[PDB]
């Protein structure tokens, strides 16, 4: 949509400025704490051979994008559910009210939540998300895919997250803030305004990852 189209242009503008080819790179000047994300994917499990893709958002809400194209999200209170059917029908309910048709999906989500809780590390554990609007909605996973080098996650708030498998580095791109958060190999988390990276530049690691990110957003837009 337009979130992705906006993000492609923001990336293209940075990359076209050749930011790792500044005489003096002042990456630190492109930092903006006001732009840190409200939400990102802190854990995920690909069980798409059988069920779907389960994930945890940094607020400890969990969701699943099931093989049948439905989506179920358990809020961080551990009771409140949001269910999205194939036709887009959206329902708000509780695990504790007793919806018979959803009990198998509920127990599947509880399985993912419990797996991720026992076994997986929380990405960005050290980071406080920025403050989000009082009446804003919790995002869900719109789309995802993997390449041989990363998993790409597209959230319904327009964010795109990219986890690089080999060195554990991660980007979180928000087209609304026009910002990227980079989590480096030593788990340092930095958030930059893309237009400032155009002004001040950045290192060859971040530059290289932003060029890859643009290729991923093109894949997103190609699937449509």
């Amino acid at each position: 949509d337009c979130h992705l189209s906006d993000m492609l242009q923001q990336l293209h503008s940075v990359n076209a400025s050749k930011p790792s080819e500044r005489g003096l790179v002042r990456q630190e000047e492109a930092e903006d704490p006001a732009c840190i994300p409200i939400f990102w994917v802190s854990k995920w499990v690909d069980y798409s051979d059988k069920y779907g893709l389960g994930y945890q958002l940094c607020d400890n809400s969990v969701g699943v994008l099931f093989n049948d194209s439905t989506r179920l999200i358990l809020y961080n209170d551990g009771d409140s559910l949001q269910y999205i059917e194939r036709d887009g029908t959206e329902s708000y309910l509780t695990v504790s009210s007793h919806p018979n048709s959803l009990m198998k999906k509920i127990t599947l989500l509880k399985y993912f939540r419990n797996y991720m809780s026992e076994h997986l590390l929380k990405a960005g554990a050290n980071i406080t998300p920025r403050e989000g609007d009082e009446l804003a909605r919790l995002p869900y996973l719109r789309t995802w895919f993997r390449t041989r080098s990363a998993i790409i996650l597209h959230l319904s708030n327009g964010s795109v997250q990219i986890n690089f498998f080999q060195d554990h580095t991660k980007l979180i791109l928000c087209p609304l803030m026009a910002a990227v958060t980079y989590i480096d190999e030593k788990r340092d988390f930095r958030t930059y305004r893309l237009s400032l990276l155009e002004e001040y530049g950045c290192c060859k690691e971040l530059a290289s990852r932003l060029r890859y990110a643009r290729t991923m957003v093109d894949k997103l837009l190609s699937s449509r």
Partner: peptide, 5 residues
Amino acid sequence: PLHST
């Protein structure tokens, strides 16, 4: 990979 780190 089949799950996160």
